[PDB]
Write a protein that binds this ligand. Structure first.
Ligand SMILES: Nc1ncnc2c1ncn2[C@@H]1O[C@H](COP(=O)(O)OP(=O)(O)OP(=O)(O)O)[C@@H](O)[C@H]1O
Ligand SMILES: [Ca+2]
Ligand SMILES: [Ca+2]
Ligand SMILES: [Ca+2]
Ligand SMILES: [Ca+2]
Ligand SMILES: [Ca+2]
Ligand SMILES: [Ca+2]
Length: 903
DNA sequence: CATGTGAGCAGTCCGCG
DNA sequence: GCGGACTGCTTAC
């Protein structure tokens, strides 16, 4: 097989690499890497090395990496550019793997672990590690086994061995319900003392050394705790055995009272699943406990236990160990669905970087561009220092706040990357500048044509048309990958709706789910078979289609983020190719594009409808337009339509057959105007929206910029079995909004858009009558707890103290000297509840760690002093007032002359 | 060590016979 | 109480 790296590190003048050899065996080696960098030399000196602007360079080969670094300093002092890849391990990988890496994940040791630590005096701080580690579960991907290390004797209690028989039993039968599919994969190892446990753990570690290390919060808890605990018991050099090169660095975050730390294990790639999830999932959650996220992703119940976690081991060691095991499995279950490890490995090896550098789009693109240029013997520019400078972005149209009955939306496919490719924006394709007219003059086609030779953006930049740029070249590769996966995602989504439609009439049979590939639209013959399947088989198929769609979502959305990241990186001062000329060339062109196409669409629709000067485009944001379709529907007349799907079909066809071509003509004309390299502005229809035919639903409304809701029947070619709400910016979409208020507000919207005013009014009345019966957690607001210390003045709020921070301080005083009430962690999320006047907490609100029940000693008082009136007003009524005034609708029946009668 | 800008809302402070 | 000014948080692109 072809060889590939696992990890790489620079340690002094040595590169330390772990890799897989030609026989599929894991190997390690230390290489005294001799790097090269480059300097500009005279034209009269012949050479095969040129910088990206075609200037000749000479290669300086160094005896070691220190010499290379030292030379960079001297060049800095002299005043001359030192070119080439200055991160030497990227150069090493590039030299060592001079081909497209094709890796085999079954050879890559992926470890998932978590530890338990009983602590009777508050949270067990990793920096101090003053308590025994009393459980570790460590799953190994190569063995496919859960290695369980169990401490039976501790100064906090001696317990009996864990029972696998009992673990496997249902909870309703006193067991722990450890999933049957992992029971046979558990290797249980009990220990009579911690020193033996830890030593065996370390020996195990040496035999099965993680390449990818993950788990939930392993970076800020598990890893530093294990490191510091081992350090305290055996000494630091023993702790260093967790690194295969015996090297670690300790990062100490001292904030202000007290301190925590991150540990870097050289030769391991740590990908904390919490960080993967945040970066790659595109959710914002009110809590990031594993219980919350597991329920969210997997619909599995919370791991239930009686009493505090500090007492769980002594009172119920059996459950304690089972839950340690299950927690580890849950991360594997989430990854099976989301496939973030796979994504990370894909992106890592594609770029030729340390796998953990997938968290940095700058490192990732720097590597991709370096490798690309190196293949043509080109030499990369030196990184430079730049002051941070704000610069202009997108254009957003101010919408008239209103209800909007029929709406069709369109937006550009991969807008910024497509602009890069169309214009040919790269560091080395800059041809010069031209004198800019006001943007409005370009939008209206009255400015002088910028150039009849070069490819232009209305920011004033010109680019070569007749040569490729590395930025366009490399961004197109990732875009094309993105597009493939998105095709699979949408097919799977369309396939899902076919199955949902068939679930309306399930057959009374015993059959199996069809063996099909969900990434491709079902053939007619598969669709016929589906119409004969049972409910059980159809639901299994619907599950598989949805898992296929999720996998496609992961792959497409993060490749999308990566290419958009390149456009953004051009405006980050730490990016080697930082250049506001290129960053603003993209954004300014975007602004022109949106406003140009708005004009063209208004022109076209006035023409086909026989009118003049009516505004069909009601909103737009960056690269999208929202077209009121009312006059289109009225042109034919609503009476002509047989059902909702008939008008949806009609608008879909109108968009595809009449609008999109007119849009394409408009953008081709714009491409000619700007003399661009290639026409890539593809503005495809997104949503078709309206009320159900014959209903009093209003279809949609806007309250303002970035705030709207649409009743959608077809989305990018997916015709829904049941209409779906597209809501942007409104409180339903905000993680700060209480969970039950999100629900209620969404149902208020659903009723507005699908049913009308009377339906709304009925629901609003019920919700107000029952609000006070909702669970306190379901109606608590959420906020991130940043800069808590700044406003902490003897446990009381300093000046400008934010509401949520004030609540935290209130909580701190109420739990003061409580030996095990959860502490609010800086930067994490909290629930927030307002408090009525005269409460015993002595302030207007309280805040506690999100995803948790508030500690029992103050829970009773919080429940008693909760200000429901304020809570209802702020979180529910005030937003709904915004929705309904915007829609010209009332959520309570207005008083009128009719109130004189008895109806 | 390091993707970007645009924009609304909820909060505090401050003014207000 | 209720605006305007300022800013933090969260989010749509
Ligand atoms: N996370 C982001 N970082 C940087 N720029 C972004 C980001 N999200 C959106 N943009 C910019 O706004 C543009 C339009 O956003 P949009 O969400 O429509 O994505 P897109 O790239 O056009 O892909 P799609 O084909 O899915 O519409 C992007 O092309 C760019
Ligand atoms: Ca635990
Ligand atoms: Ca788009
Ligand atoms: Ca059927
Ligand atoms: Ca868009
Ligand atoms: Ca699209
Ligand atoms: Ca109490």
């Amino acid at each position: 097989m072809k060889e590939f790296y696992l990890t790489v590190e620079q340690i002094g003048d040595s590169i330390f690499e772990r890799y897989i050899d030609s026989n599929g065996r894991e190997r390690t080696r230390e290489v005294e890497y001799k790097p090269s960098l480059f300097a500009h030399c005279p034209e009269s000196q012949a050479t095969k090395y040129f910088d990206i602007y075609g200037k000749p360079c000479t290669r300086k080969l160094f005896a070691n990496m220190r010499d290379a670094s030292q030379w960079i300093k001297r060049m800095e002092d002299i005043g001359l550019e030192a070119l080439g890849m200055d991160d030497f391990k990227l150069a090493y990988l590039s030299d060592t793997y001079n081909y497209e890496i094709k890796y085999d994940h079954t050879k890559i040791r992926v470890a998932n672990f978590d530890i338990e630590v009983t602590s009777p005096d508050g949270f067990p701080e990793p920096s101090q590690a003053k308590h025994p580690i009393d459980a570790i579960t460590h799953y190994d991907s190569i063995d496919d086994r859960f290695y369980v290390f169990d401490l039976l004797n501790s100064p906090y209690g001696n317990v009996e061995e864990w029972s696998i028989e009992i673990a496997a039993k249902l909870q309703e039968q006193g067991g722990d319900e450890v999933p049957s599919e992992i029971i046979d994969k558990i290797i249980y190892m009990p220990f009579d003392n911690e020193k033996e446990l830890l030593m065996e753990y370390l020996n195990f570690w040496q035999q099965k050394t993680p390449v990818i290390l993950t788990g939930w919060n392993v970076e800020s808890f598990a890893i530093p705790y294990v490191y510091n605990r081992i350090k305290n018991i055996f000494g630091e050099s023993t702790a260093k055995r967790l690194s295969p090169h015996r090297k670690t660095r300790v990062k100490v975050i001292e904030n202000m009272y007290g301190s925590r730390e991150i540990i870097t294990l050289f030769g391991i790639s740590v990908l904390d699943y919490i960080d993967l999830y945040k970066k790659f999932s595109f959710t914002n959650q009110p809590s990031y406990s594993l219980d919350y996220i597991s329920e969210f992703e997997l619909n599995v119940g919370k791991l239930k236990y009686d009493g505090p976690i500090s007492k769980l081991r002594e009172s119920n060691h059996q459950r304690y160990i089972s839950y340690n095991i299950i927690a580890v499995y849950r991360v594997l279950q989430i990854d099976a669905k989301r496939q973030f490890i796979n994504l990370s490995l894909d992106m890592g090896y594609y770029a030729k970087i340390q796998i953990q550098s997938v968290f940095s789009p700058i490192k990732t693109w720097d590597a991709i561009i370096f490798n690309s240029l190196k293949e043509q013997n080109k030499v990369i520019p030196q990184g430079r220092s730049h002051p941070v400078q704000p610069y202009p972005g997108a254009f957003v149209k101010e919408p008239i706040p209103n209800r909007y009955k029929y709406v069709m939306s369109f937006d550009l496919t991969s807008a910024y990357p497509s602009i890069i490719r169309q214009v040919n924006i790269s560091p080395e394709t800059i041809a010069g500048t031209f004198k800019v007219a006001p943007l409005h003059d370009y939008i209206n086609a009255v400015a002088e044509r910028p150039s009849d030779v070069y490819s232009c953006s209305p920011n004033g930049m010109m680019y070569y048309k007749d040569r490729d740029g590395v930025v366009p070249t490399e961004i197109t590769k990732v875009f094309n990958q993105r597009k493939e996966h998105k095709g699979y995602m949408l097919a799977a989504q369309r396939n899902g709706e076919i199955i949902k439609e068939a679930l309306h009439n399930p057959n009374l049979s015993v059959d199996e789910p069809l063996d099909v590939d969900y990434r491709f639209d079902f053939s007619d013959e598969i669709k016929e078979k589906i119409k004969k399947l049972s409910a059980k088989s159809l639901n299994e198929m619907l599950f598989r289609a949805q898992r296929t769609e999720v996998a496609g979502m992961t792959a497409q959305i993060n490749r999308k983020a990566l290419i958009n990241g390149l456009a953004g990186a051009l405006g980050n001062v730490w990016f080697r190719y930082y250049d506001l000329r290129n960053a603003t060339a993209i954004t300014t062109f975007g602004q022109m594009a949106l406003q140009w196409i708005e004009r063209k669409v208004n022109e076209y629709l006035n023409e086909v409808c026989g009118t003049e000067g009516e505004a069909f485009v009601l909103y737009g944001d960056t690269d999208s337009i929202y077209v009121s379709a009312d006059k289109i529907i009225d042109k034919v007349g609503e009476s002509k339509f047989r059902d909702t799907n008939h008008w949806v079909d009609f608008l879909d066809k109108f968009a595809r057959e009449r609008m999109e071509p007119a849009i394409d003509r408009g953008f081709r004309e714009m491409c000619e105007y700007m003399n661009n390299k290639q026409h890539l502005m593809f503005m495809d229809r997104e949503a078709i929206a309206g009320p159900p035919l014959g209903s009093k639903g209003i279809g949609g409304f806007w309250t303002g910029k970035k705030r709207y809701a649409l009743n959608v029947w077809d989305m990018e070619g997916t015709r829904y079995a049941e209409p779906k709400l597209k809501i942007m910016g409104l409180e339903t979409q905000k993680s700060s909004t209480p969970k039950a208020v999100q629900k209620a507000l969404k149902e208020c919207i659903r009723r507005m858009l699908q049913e009308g005013e009377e339906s709304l009014q009925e629901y609003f009345k019920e919700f107000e009558k029952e609000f006070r019966q909702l669970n306190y957690i379901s109606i608590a607001s959420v906020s991130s707890a940043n800069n808590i210390a700044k406003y902490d003045v003897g446990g009381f709020p300093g000046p400008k103290c934010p509401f949520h921070i004030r609540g935290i301080l209130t909580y701190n005083r109420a739990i003061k000297g409580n030996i095990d009430a959860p502490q609010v962690v800086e930067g994490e999320k909290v629930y927030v509840l307002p408090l009525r006047e005269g409460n015993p907490f002595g302030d207007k609100c309280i805040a506690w760690p999100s995803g948790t029940e508030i500690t029992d000693l103050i829970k009773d008082d919080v429940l008693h002093w909760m200000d429901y009136t304020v809570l209802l007003e702020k979180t529910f009524i005030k937003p709904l007032e915004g929705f309904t005034s915007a829609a010209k609708l009332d959520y309570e029946k207005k008083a009128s002359l009719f109130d004189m009668f008895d109806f």
